[PDB]
Symmetry: D2
Subunit: 290 residues, 4 copies
Amino acid sequence: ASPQELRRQVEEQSRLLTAAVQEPIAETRDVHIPVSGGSIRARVYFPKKAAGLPAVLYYHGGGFVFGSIETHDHICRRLSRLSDSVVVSVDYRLAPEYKFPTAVEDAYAALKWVADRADELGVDPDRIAVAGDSAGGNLAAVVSILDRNSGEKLVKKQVLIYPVVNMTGVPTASLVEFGVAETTSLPIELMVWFGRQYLKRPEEAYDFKASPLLADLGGLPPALVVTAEYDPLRDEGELYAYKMKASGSRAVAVRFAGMVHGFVSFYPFVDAGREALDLAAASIRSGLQP
Amino acid sequence: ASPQELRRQVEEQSRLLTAAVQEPIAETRDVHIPVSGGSIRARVYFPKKAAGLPAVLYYHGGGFVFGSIETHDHICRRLSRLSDSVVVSVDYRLAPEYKFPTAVEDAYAALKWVADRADELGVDPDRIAVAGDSAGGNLAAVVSILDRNSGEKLVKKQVLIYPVVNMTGVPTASLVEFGVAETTSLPIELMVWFGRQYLKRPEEAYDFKASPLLADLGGLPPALVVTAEYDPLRDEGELYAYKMKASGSRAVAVRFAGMVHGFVSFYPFVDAGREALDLAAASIRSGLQP
Amino acid sequence: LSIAASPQELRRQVEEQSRLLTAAVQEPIAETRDVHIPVSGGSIRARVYFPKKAAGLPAVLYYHGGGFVFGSIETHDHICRRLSRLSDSVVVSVDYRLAPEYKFPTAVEDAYAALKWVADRADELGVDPDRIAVAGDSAGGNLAAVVSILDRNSGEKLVKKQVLIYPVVNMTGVPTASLVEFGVAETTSLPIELMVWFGRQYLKRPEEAYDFKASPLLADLGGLPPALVVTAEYDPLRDEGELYAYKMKASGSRAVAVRFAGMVHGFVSFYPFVDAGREALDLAAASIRSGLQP
Amino acid sequence: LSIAASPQELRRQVEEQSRLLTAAVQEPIAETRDVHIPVSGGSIRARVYFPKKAAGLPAVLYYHGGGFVFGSIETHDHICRRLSRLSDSVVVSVDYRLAPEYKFPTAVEDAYAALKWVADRADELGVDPDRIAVAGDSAGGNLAAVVSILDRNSGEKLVKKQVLIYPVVNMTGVPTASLVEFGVAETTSLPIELMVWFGRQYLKRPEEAYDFKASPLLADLGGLPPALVVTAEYDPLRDEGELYAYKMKASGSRAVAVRFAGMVHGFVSFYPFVDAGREALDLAAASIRSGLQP
């Protein structure tokens, strides 16, 4: 099936699946963010009604092809509340329609937009983080490298939840192991698919904005990377952390037992995803303390 | 060297090592708890001045031979504060002086003492947890099984931080792997030592109060077990969790990369120990919500 | 399988299942002789495999797997023939008595007795008594490891080398990471439930699990004959197998552990169909050949 | 070692170091002949090892390891003699040209050329052209794997089997879990710094790392000759080695991967001193023997 039809299914599936969670929150404001060639949508979650609050940029997962604001709305509500920070979930553009660079560029613009319109949003400028799951973690990681290179220091902390950091063809042992098994949640055939729908040409994969791990990782904001024991992205996510730390950037990698890829997403239904969001939040909260 | 001299060294070492952390807190009350054949000491940490607060029983580590209230005072202060619960650190009796049963019995009495004198302590009875690191995790696990068997339901949540759950002679692969390496923090020779100083006879090790994992683990309070990638107790700690969950008891096992045994203890100096205490707390806090 | 059923009928289903395996391969061997070995209470069968016709030949005692309840000389006849011809050794496969009928140390005792029988009957066998090794798979590896310990405690030095194929060396409830990981998997050839059942059929009193003749890993493994330990990546026994080789080495005995990728417990029996079973068998035969050089 | 020093002098320290290894063992072989093989730009040396004196013998091309910068026929003379006598094959060790002097595809080209030379000179060699295999360790395994791919793309079917000992199959910066874990360890025989340096000495333009003749793992591994892949538990190359066997299998080619416990990269070279190096060598010789049966 066509990417458009898998996208409409994953959406139906997820809403259908989260017609129950009730994640309380304070205010939610839906915004529009100017990007090259138009605008995108974002949703800001206010934990309280106050001034100078920390802010987190959440980039949803979905292989650069799926996912939406609504798709990770529950996750963002709980974060906002548990970390007590504003969360601006970004509806970055999706592939095969908008190919590689694009998603990465809006994620970056979003971030920038969030710091310049921060009085408005009632957010503290010197206290902003970037989080994301799967393809979102990637964007969160790349965005963090753009902020580094740019030298604007907008990112103070990062939370990579099962990031894909290597889009090359050089597989990992966990990649193959959990990509092939008869009980994964992230078929190797589907990952190779994501890649095709997103990258124009495939050496684009050797680019640092596509594969964040191939980049020099010195000089980056403190990072919290979460992994799943039975996730094909496990080795890479954990290797991302090692590398940051070896290059002088602070990193902590926590791996949850018995979990599969995308488990935080089923948090209202799996305990481990609860303990993981609770951690993400606590990590953000301490990371953004003045 | 004699157990007494290793005990005086570990103490000097730790205080010496934590002459800096400043863990703020609200009030601390040092108590005396009646046990069979005398009394023991405990230290209660108040996070705020209030009524009906959740409470956590912290059992310090040290192989049933070392450790003290002062030795894990920093850890207990931060917990209290981050979880916003009372923490009563228990100076259970230590081996070769007081051998196996004893430590386990005071840990249990402590727990009981804490629920009956709870109006006094200003603590909520229906909201109590048990936490502990290394030998302390063991005690926390055993105490949780005593509460189960007893049927009093005093324990609502448990936080096993690198628990030793198998004191038998049936080694684990991680046990051997990280017990022998040229860079562990938990020499296999020293563990075999702990065992000798604590157990009278060595089949005592096959007893459930010595080796919590050999027990049937159905019907236990929700548990959060934390492991270290380079810890000889890793496999057992993670196996403890699997077993609880297989027997119908809820459990989540999180393993931190690059860490060694006893790392939370060096939290003010290692980031991963920070992220781990932050998690312990968040786990306790959600676990004790009415 | 289904342990819901009796051991004897399960022994039958297994027997038919395994012989479809020996049927698929033609393994030449210069000769065979079915023998009857004296043990306490009678005799057990044994099949002697002759690689060539000569004197002073090296020999290998082979103990078949089957969880102490299944298996027979027939069940592992292909493995033994191939083993025999590649190492150029006399292989004698032992039909040790089975549980639940005959319970634990029996088999161990039959095994050790079969070893003494070979050394005593070496001239009649065309064997060089100073050149003997022991080998086996699953429960068979246990027997081989225990037999090596018995041979050591006795100070006779009959066992010059031991080849343990996916051996079970720990029969207590203290699980390993691999024990549970592959014991519980949906794709397991050695379910945890079946392993638990083997023990109930084999041991009379659950604390016999603590005897070294049942859980060899609990013994002092120093001073043992050189060991070659073969394990499988998805075998629940994997960890205890490697733990055993390490422990031996740490105690001064020589041991080498090899892990076959992509394999499950019992893959050697399927050698005709699985390339890896065949590579494993060739390593074993080469390991024996070299271990038995004068 | 110290890469702070030049390649040529490091090549010397290594040469002396490795020959203390060949010195420790006496490995009989019916015969040897040092030969000179024609390649683009001249000739490379090769040493032919004859196991016995006969016609129609099976043969194995052997490519020594050394990170494409070190090693020589002398450096692996013991391994080849032993390999030769245990498989009963003619082994021809190739002295392929080294980097940095001669850079990447050279060695690959020397290797493939050495393979064609053996098949063409088989009658003069007492070899059965239909029974040839290739083998090697570290960079030598790379050459053997690449040679197998070249032999396949050519459709000549010269390679009947390939034995890859702790092969390096990926020369890009995309690390594996094992690559970093053992590359950075204090107890590593293959530091990450040295691996990075080998690549700079071997490749002229860093994106050649993406060519299949350098990073065989990137090729379509379907339709290749049977593979036996040997890895070590603490080898940084461990994961890519096993990844390679799996990929081959998933593509329809036959492959078997064996992981030796407690070993580091290069343990086979130390076979005289390490029991496991010896067991590994015997598996390889047995794997070739069986793979080359008519």
